[PDB]
């Protein structure tokens, strides 16, 4: 992402800080949520096997 000299943050949907500029070294780094999901258990009948 190209940042103007006077810009600090970024927000695509206007409530999430998508990007940020490091105060020490003036470079621009983007930020992504780590990970998450659901766990599903595929199984046949417990009567059949385990």
């Amino acid at each position, epitope marked *: 992402k*190209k940042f103007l000299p*006077f810009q600090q943050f970024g927000r695509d949907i206007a409530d999430t800080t998508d990007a940020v500029r490091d105060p020490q070294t003036l470079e621009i780094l983007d930020i992504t949520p780590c990970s998450f999901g659901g766990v599903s258990v595929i199984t046949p009948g417990t009567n059949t096997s385990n």
Partner: nanobody, 117 residues
Framework: VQLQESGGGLVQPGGSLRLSCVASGSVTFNSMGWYRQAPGKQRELVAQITAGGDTHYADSVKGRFTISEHRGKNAVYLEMHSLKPEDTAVYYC?????????????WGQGTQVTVSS
């Protein structure tokens, strides 16, 4: 805020170093300049490169300090050679934003370089 400058350190006389003006974004300008200032002395213009490419050099720094500009990283560079104890100072770089016909440079931050044995 805009521009900040970092790099370099203390080196014994007879060495070399590289000073960098870390990029703070793509800005319009026409003259990237370098001074060094030491306590008890005024801010002396030591180096200056132009948008055209004119490398101004002061008489006490010719042949030892050189300027380059990297458009790929937008950053200015100063390669320093054959250091002397008179070079002990804090170094700052101005830009050439064209305010009101020209002015309001941005050397607000610099790097301390001390040359001593």
């Amino acid at each position: 805020v805009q521009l900040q400058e970092s790099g370099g350190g203390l080196v014994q006389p007879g060495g070399s170093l590289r000073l960098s003006c870390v990029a703070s974004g793509s800005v319009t300008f026409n003259s990237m300049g370098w001074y060094r200032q030491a306590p008890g002395k005024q801010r002396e213009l030591v180096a200056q490169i132009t948008a055209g490419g004119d490398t101004h050099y002061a008489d006490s720094v010719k042949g030892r300090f050189t300027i380059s500009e990297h458009r790929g990283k937008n950053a200015v560079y100063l390669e320093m050679h054959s250091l002397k104890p008179e070079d002990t100072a804090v170094y700052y770089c101005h830009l050439q934003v064209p305010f009101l016909g020209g002015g309001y440079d941005y050397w607000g931050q610099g790097t301390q370089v001390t040359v001593s044995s």
